[PDB]
Amino acid sequence: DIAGLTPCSESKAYAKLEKKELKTLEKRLKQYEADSAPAVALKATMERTKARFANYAKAGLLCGNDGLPHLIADPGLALKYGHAGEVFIPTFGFLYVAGYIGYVGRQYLIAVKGEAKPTDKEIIIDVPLATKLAWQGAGWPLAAVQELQRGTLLEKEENITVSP
Amino acid sequence: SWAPSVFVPLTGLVLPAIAMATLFVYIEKEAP
């Protein structure tokens, strides 16, 4: 109960929706022989379904009046009430990989600018240079702040403009 | 009570027929 909400292990619409999905799977299962190949896949779907409900109720997700889990996207209401794995932990688990790709592509461009003709190594990617920059880009925030402290991250007004 | 049976054909069939005529004649006038 952060903003009119309720834990999903407490709310009854969540359990009613679990029983609704298991009821649809059960009346779907009632047509087949108990050991046939469709019935095995239907019971495996039931097992994945029940494991999904158990692990959404276990992590302390907040349900609403609809019986559906919600995501508190504010630190200080996620850190204080234990919901940092909703948004606040994957908002850095994403940005590590985002700045990773943005650093690997940056360094692949800068390490191919100073050649004979760079464009041929942009349609035909130099794979050993690409995999070297793929592995050694693991510490990208480190190298990014060390590049920002120089001023070698930005370029000055050598850039191309029109008519200011 | 006879106003919607008279003003509506004038405004839609008669006064636009003036406007389809007099505002069209003004278009192709030869400039002196």
């Binding site: - | 003004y26 278009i27 192709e28 006038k29 030869e30 400039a31």
Partner: protein, 71 residues
């Protein structure tokens, strides 16, 4: 030949876009032929009187049709 009285270049247009651009750059007063800044401001002032009179005529029509054909 006559209808864009404001545009002598549109008036010499033998095609049918003379009509369409006489209707469309009629209120672009700054691009009119012989336009000065004083006549610009004077036409804008008269235009604002025309817009105010249309707004009041429209509201009076709303009032009259509600008073006459309404409940």
């Amino acid at each position: 030949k006559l209808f864009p009285k404001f545009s002598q270049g549109l008036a010499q247009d033998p095609t049918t876009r003379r009509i369409w651009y006489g209707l469309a750059m009629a209120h672009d007063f700054e691009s009119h032929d012989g336009m000065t800044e004083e006549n610009l401001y004077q036409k804008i002032f008269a235009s604002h009187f025309g817009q105010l009179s249309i707004i009041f005529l429209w509201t009076s029509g709303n009032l009259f049709h509600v008073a006459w054909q309404g409940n």
